[PDB]
Amino acid sequence: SGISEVRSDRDKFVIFLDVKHFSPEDLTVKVQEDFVEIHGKHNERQDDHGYISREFHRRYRLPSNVDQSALSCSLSADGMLTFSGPKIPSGVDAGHSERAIPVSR
Amino acid sequence: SGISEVRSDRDKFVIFLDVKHFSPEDLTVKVQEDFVEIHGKHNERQDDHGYISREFHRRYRLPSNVDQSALSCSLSADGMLTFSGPKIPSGVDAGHSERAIPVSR
Ligand SMILES: [Zn+2]
Ligand SMILES: [Zn+2]
């Protein structure tokens, strides 16, 4: 869905960002103040002592019910960055059919 | 597969233990020295000032490649206890097609 697609549904929050002109090592992702801050900078030599630098920053609001301890981010072979996090479950019927048993370590 | 079924495959380790005569609060699960230690004790009044206590302990070896930080345990409506943990992935082709990007917090 173009350069940037942000989907937020009952179970998860996902950002898809096209960064095809970048290398994986050029990207940083940082979460602060309920924002996702994504940066990239990529430099290339061009003919006759030229060069090009491409750079971006994208700030996205993180939904308040995303679990910030379960965030993940990956870059696909074709240069799509996916950032995602699960939403914290509704407590309705928590433990109704199956019940969690604590595992002590 | 009877009282106790232990399955260990490429991706996970799972114990299924029938504890139908127990209540959820009667069970404890503790991991120590690469063992899972499961205990239950359940007491019931019976007629004419009688009572019955049922108790068990089951120790299971945890495979060395299970991720002990990702263990889970649940009790089903019909009284089956499931303990499971994922195995740590093989590193072969880690990041080959899609690459993890660190999320700094
Ligand atoms: Zn390049
Ligand atoms: Zn009972």
B48, two tokens = 């004419």
B93 within some domain: no
User: Are B13 and B62 contacting, i.e. CB atoms less than 8 angstroms apart?
Assistant: yes
Does residue A95 belong to any structural domain of this protein? no
For residue A8, which of A70, A75, A78, A60 has the smallest C-alpha distance? A60
Q: Tell me whether residue A96 is in a domain.
A: no
Mind telling me how many Å the CA of A39 is from chain B's nearest CA?
12
Ligand nearest to the CA of B46: 2
The answer as to whether A3 is a domain residue is no
Structural domain includes residue A44: yes
CA distance B83 to chain A (A): 9
Nearest to A59 by CA among A81, A86, A31: A31
Expressed as residue numbers, the domain containing B76 is 12-88
The total domain count for chain A is 1
Burial class (CB in 10 A: 0-12, 13-18, 19+), A46: exposed
Resolution in A: 1.1
**Are the beta carbons of B52 and B44 closer than 8 angstroms?**
yes
Cα B15–B17–B19 angle (5° rounding)? 155
Q: Any idea what the CATH number is for the domain that residue A57 is in?
A: 2.60.40.790
Q: Which of B28, B97, B102 sits opposite A29 (nearest CB)?
A: B102
